Amino acid sequence: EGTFLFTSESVGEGHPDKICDQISDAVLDAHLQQDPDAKVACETVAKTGMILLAGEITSRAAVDYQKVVREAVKHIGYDDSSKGFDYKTCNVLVALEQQSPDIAQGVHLDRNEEDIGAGDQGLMFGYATDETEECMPLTIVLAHKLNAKLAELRRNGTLPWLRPDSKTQVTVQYMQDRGAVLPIRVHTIVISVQHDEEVCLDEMRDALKEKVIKAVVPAKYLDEDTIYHLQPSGRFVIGGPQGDAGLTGRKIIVDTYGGWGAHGGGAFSGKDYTKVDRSAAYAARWVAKSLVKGGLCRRVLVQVSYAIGVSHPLSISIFHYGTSQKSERELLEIVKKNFDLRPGVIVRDLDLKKPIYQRTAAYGHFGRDSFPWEVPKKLKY
Template identity: 70%
Template sequence: MFGYATDETVEAMPMTLLLAHKLNARLHKLRRDGTLPWVRPDSKSQVTIEYTFDGGACLPRRVHTVVLSTQHNPEITMETLRRELMEKVVKFVIPADIMDENTIFHLNPCGSFITGGPMGDAGLTGRKIIVDTYGGWGAHGGGAFSGKDPTKVDRSAAYAARWVAKSLVKAKVCRRCLVQVSYAIGVAKPLSVMVFSFGTSALEEHELLQIVNDNFDLRPGKIIKELNLKRPMYQVTAENGHFGHEEFPWEQPKPLRISPELLKKSKGRPRLPRIRRYGRGKRRG
């Protein structure tokens, strides 16, 4: 299971995915309150952003393309639909300072979208594992979340890995973080824990791992207890992603206990990732 965090947004989420979720959330808020009565429940969004990179950290520069398609009633015209999507959804969500005259907008680009949801597509459960997580950033272990109780590490450990990654980024010991954790059935303690900072930390990976081990107990039972995962809250996660929403306990950064030596070192200049080369040197054995 993997957790990911990046300092490019306040939520520590990739801006591409965050804006895509916000487009859907805004669209369906207006559907529910009656502002856009012609909108139906099914919709799709995608945001393409141009980035530059600063030593491994992601710096969003401009929105390249916005895609938003929504199911609708048969009476609405495409002209009205596209105008209202642009004025009441896109311009409300996408910051004006990262859009320009070259930004491309595809609003219901295929035209009419009347039949949607289970009537239009079969076999949706568990299929959207990337949009549920980080939109292709970071990594994914392959397990879906929805439909699983928190004793399944596919769900609980992925939430914990996000908690760890976000806590490290918010503590400013790195600007971008990927956490990997693996388990065996019947073994409570993780088989392995890996922390990768993409070269955005002054600390070595083993020092970041020391901070994780000093602050987090990643046994499934402890994860369930610390994040209170047995309370009913999972219906909300099925819409607009499992991460980046402050109401979820795994989105609350944990105050970290860091030794004075590591804390001082973490304020230094980020180091470049170490590249290990294999296949050279004397043969052993």
């Protein structure tokens, strides 16, 4: 009684949608290295033999798109036709134009940086939960770590039949606790990973349990009843873009909270700070995490929204699930007094002209690596 199941998923660095996110952010970073004020809206599409860049960039940088794209694919591990994709020999097509002058004039032309308008309308959420030290849902943390473990064992050569494309999924049984949530046990794990033509199914399934799951998931969460779906399709030799087209911004729940909290729909990768889809979502995470680490809440969801061309958010809302002694109205006043959510101020607080974005584009944007939005602000109230 009072228990429920909840499932989240993650994907690996060579999952075709994630390839696109990483390439889009490699392009962003390449621009920002030369022009910190570059306006970038770079979408990537991947299919057999093809990376296409489409979108809008206005920048003083001189960027070699062939080199940037191919080096990103190399880093991911697609380096031979036997793996289904090769950075050395794939097609890289570019359909990039300047940013629309109508957008530019309405957003940032002749505006003081702090008073730049939002680059679009939209809604964004931030979420934090005390169930893990990194203030993230356990389901998504574990799912990400299973993909990272696969990449580790591929790159270190101990499971050399692995290829870069993978997906994982973790179902946890939770107990509710005064609006907070408490993980009890892992109910089901799925792992699917691209593999070579020689390794057999039983070798893979044994390795995925013993060398992947047991190396990631604490034994206290695994029991005789846990269900394992390891290579459930039976065969995954064809993978990467050859198996499934990829696009930027098609893993937005993997990028965020694994189904927990809420999402406003905007993708992160390929976008400079003036695109509030990214900057305001990062700021909202920073607010949520600051509220939890500051001891005001155990679990919290923050919504913000914007209109194109308008600097201040149109709305700010907080929901604490019953996990604060303060009302949400009081928390909102605390947030108002401690944070300025104009994009031209967020950029300063979170250092969003720095070319660190490719690092955000796999394994989730939140809960990792002490990025600026992961360092709580000390709140005055």
